[PDB]
Amino acid sequence: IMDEIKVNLQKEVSLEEAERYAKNIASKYGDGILLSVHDSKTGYRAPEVYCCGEKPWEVYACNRGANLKISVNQFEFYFRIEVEG
Amino acid sequence: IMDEIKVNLQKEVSLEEAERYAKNIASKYGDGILLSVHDSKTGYRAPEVYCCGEKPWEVYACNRGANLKISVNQFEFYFRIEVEG
């Protein structure tokens, strides 16, 4: 469980457009290290993790200290927000 | 129906804190004119519109050209985002 931001836009978005939207939001909180992405419409994920097993893109991100989930329509982006501290 | 951003934070937020969070997000898209606010925990709304009838704070905002709804935990903020166009 991490902080979450869910964006629902009336227009359709591409992966690139959604990522730009997500990175723009993340940037208000610090240095946004994008760890993983998932497309809930197509099943696509990055990095290439398949068959291992339940939501592997999320498990991957959480194991790398993900602390902010940003969804933009069908896309979910998992960030580690780094701060100067 | 307008574009929506829903923020779910692990920490508890005050009205002032939630408004600051919302205004900060809105600012990436243009000049954020805050039209109305509602607290879903207490029933509080601004401006002072009561008994008129279903979600009057939302009706008020929509009649003033609200185009972005930002929720921060229990709070909902309705903005008219103005652009230079």
Domain boundaries, chain A: 1-85
| C-alpha distance from A19 to closest chain B C-alpha (Å) | 15
Experimental method: X-ray
Q: Which CATH number fits domain A1-85: 3.90.700.10, 3.30.1490.340, 3.50.50.60, 3.40.50.300?
A: 3.30.1490.340
Could you give the angle at the alpha carbon of A26 between the alpha carbons of A25 and A28, nearest 5°?
A: 75
Q: Pick from B34, A17, A12, B64: which is nearest to B72 by CA?
A: B34
Rounded to the nearest angstrom, the minimum Cα separation between A50 and chain B is 29
What tokens does A59 get?
A: 């498990």
Cβ-count burial B23-57 (b if 16+ within 10 Å, e if not): eebbeebbebbbbbbbbeeeeebeeeeeeeeeebb
CA distance B44 to B34: 16
